[PDB]
């Protein structure tokens, strides 16, 4: 929320904070009490940028479905790491095809 | 017209008189100061050493031979310090709108409109970066309201002064137009 990051700036979550401050100042005043309610989603996006709890929850689930799906299907021939270190190289076109399985 | 007369978000303060500058330059504050400010500043300044002298005559300190002379120089420095801070604060409150500034609005309008028609930047040009000019402005805005604690002055030519600048360009337009027809009709 400071706007200055570790590498010479800016900070990763600073855009969400300015989006949150913009929402509050421009929709909430003393005339209308519930204007701030348009800020509830924007604050969650900023709490989520800092802590990444909801994203972690999506990945833990999606990763559990992915592993339980690729642990039961038939495997023909898994590519060795050396094959996937020659992928996209100018003289190893045979290995790129195997990696791409095309 | 640069098409962005108000370019920076600024704090509006509830005061009693029109705001001229949220952060005037030091040279302008001295320039717009009234002769009453000079008397008030000098009057306060002398009050510090004079209080120490009067306090010496009535309740004597019983110090040794050179102590009072050292104390008077320290009271004298604090007199000139406090006296100039009080004098500079009296002039700045009229730019801030916190004191009767009717004369100063007239001076400012003249100076800035005569800058506009001279092709000059309204507030001058900084050797500092646009971003450092922003940082400086965010430090000296309404700063003299804090002299009782910490001293700060503006020595940076930036264009973040809290005011929409259309009025300056509008009067320059109406003043060049007033003189153009007169020059061509006679």
């Amino acid at each position: 929320a400071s706007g200055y990051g570790l590498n010479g700036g800016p900070s990763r979550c600073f855009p969400f904070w300015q989006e949150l401050l913009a929402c509050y100042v421009t929709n909430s005043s003393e005339d209308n009490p519930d204007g701030k309610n348009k800020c509830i989603p924007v604050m969650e996006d900023y709490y989520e940028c800092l802590h990444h709890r909801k994203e972690a929850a999506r990945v833990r689930a999606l990763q559990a479905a992915y592993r339980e799906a690729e642990a039961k299907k038939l495997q023909e021939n898994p590519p060795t790491a050396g094959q996937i270190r020659n992928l996209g190289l100018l003289n190893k076109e045979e290995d790129t095809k195997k990696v791409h399985c095309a | 017209t640069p098409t962005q007369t108000y370019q920076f978000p600024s704090k509006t303060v509830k005061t009693d008189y029109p705001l001229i500058d949220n952060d005037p330059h030091f040279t302008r504050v001295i320039r717009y100061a009234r002769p009453s400010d000079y008397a008030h500043g000098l009057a306060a300044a002398a009050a510090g050493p004079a209080a120490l002298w009067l306090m010496e005559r009535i309740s004597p300190s019983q110090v040794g031979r050179g102590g009072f002379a050292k104390a008077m120089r320290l009271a004298g420095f604090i007199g000139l310090a406090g006296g100039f801070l009080y004098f500079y604060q009296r002039s700045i409150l009229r730019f801030y709108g916190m004191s009767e500034n009717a004369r100063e609005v007239e001076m400012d309008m003249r100076e800035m409109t005569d800058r506009v028609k001279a092709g000059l930047p309204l507030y001058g040009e900084s050797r500092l970066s646009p971003a450092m000019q922003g940082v400086a402005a965010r430090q000296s805005r309404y700063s003299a309201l804090f002299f009782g604690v910490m001293p700060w002055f503006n020595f940076v030519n930036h264009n973040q002064h809290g005011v929409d600048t259309a009025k300056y360009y509008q009067q320059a337009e109406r003043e060049l137009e007033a003189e153009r027809l007169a020059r061509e009709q006679a």
Binding site: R12, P15, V99, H100 | -
Partner: protein
């Protein structure tokens, strides 16, 4: 993925999934770091408008510019591809001599002035393209056009002359 520098990275995750057919395709640039720096000023001499449109476009769409600015990115890679093709077709001998120098000089331009000067004279004569560093001081010779380079590891020979476009 996150722009944080990694501290304990031991594994790489690749993804063989291609782009969807709907996105128009592009052939990516195949020049390495040193050839790109040799031709960096030539690419900015010709591609500057397209390079500036792309950055201006992404700016006009905050948080949504990776998508929503694809066509412009494809225009920058085609224009940069056209400059790399042209140096190869005409300036190949001097071009390789320059970036192979930068290979052994920490990729520092001041270390390879003689090769750049001969490449500058080939490009300017063949592609009319000139190297301009913007906002350089006016009271002194341009640093890239100076006979002597103080921070150069090896002295520049006096007979090696800086290329001035027209003399």
């Amino acid at each position: 993925m996150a722009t944080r520098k990694p501290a304990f990275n031991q594994h790489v995750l690749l993804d063989t999934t291609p782009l969807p057919d709907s996105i128009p395709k592009v052939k990516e640039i195949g020049a390495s770091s040193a050839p790109l720096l040799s031709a960096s000023f030539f690419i900015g001499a010709r591609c500057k408008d397209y390079n500036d449109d792309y950055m201006q476009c992404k700016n006009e769409n905050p948080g949504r510019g990776e998508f929503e600015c694809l066509k412009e990115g494809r225009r920058v890679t085609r224009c940069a591809r056209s400059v790399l093709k042209d140096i190869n077709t005409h300036c190949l001998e001097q071009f390789r001599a320059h970036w192979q120098c930068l290979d052994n000089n920490n990729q520092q331009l001041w270390q390879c002035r003689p090769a750049e000067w001969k490449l500058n004279k080939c490009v300017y004569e063949n592609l009319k393209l000139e190297k301009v560093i913007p906002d350089q001081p006016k009271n002194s010779t341009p640093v890239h056009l100076r006979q002597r380079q103080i921070f150069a590891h090896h002295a520049i020979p006096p007979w090696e002359r800086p290329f001035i476009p027209g003399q």
